[PDB]
Design a protein around this ligand. Structure first.
Ligand SMILES: Nc1nc2ncccc2[nH]1
Length: 154
């Protein structure tokens, strides 16, 4: 039948030559995992404006964003998909702050904390680091198990 309906999300990676800024999600779904900053796009908002807003709300940073990929997530037992538009920037001009949602830390690019990131990151995060654009899809059973995935460079 028809592909499930999807909700629009953004995800922003602050990626400098030697390090990346990640946030530890403090509560809710996926709490305890490190990742980029993002959330739901709001009604009438452009995707890039939503990405800037989520970066500011979750990390305090105000920034040019570059579109780097799109990843669709499906969870067993939930008919609605997450359609995540991924962005990255190298240029910041303020300091990240802990928010209600996220605790920030910088990681060197030889210390990407995959053990404490979502399992899908092993597949697409390396493409982001190589500046290669991508489209991916991941079906999860719960928070740990991937039952199916597709990934391509574009
Ligand atoms: N990398 C990544 N972030 C996620 N957030 C929520 C669900 C699945 C996710 N995979």
């Amino acid at each position: 039948g028809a592909m499930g309906a999807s909700r629009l999300y953004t995800l922003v990676l602050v990626l400098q030559p030697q390090r990346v800024l990640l946030g530890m999600k403090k509560r809710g779904f996926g709490a305890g995992r490190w990742g980029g900053f993002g959330g739901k796009v709001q009604e009438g908002e452009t995707i890039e404006d939503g990405a800037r807003r989520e970066l500011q709300e979750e990390s305090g940073l105000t920034v040019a964003l570059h579109k780097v990929g799109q990843i669709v997530f499906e969870f067993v037992g939930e008919p609605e998909l997450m359609d995540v538009h991924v962005f990255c920037t190298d240029s910041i001009q303020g300091t990240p702050v802990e928010s209600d949602e996220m605790r920030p830390c910088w990681f060197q690019l030889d210390q990407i904390p995959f053990k404490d990131m979502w399992p899908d990151d092993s597949y697409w995060f390396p493409l982001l680091l190589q500046k290669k654009k991508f489209h991916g899809y991941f079906k999860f059973q719960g928070q740990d198990t991937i039952l199916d995935y597709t990934l391509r460079e574009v």
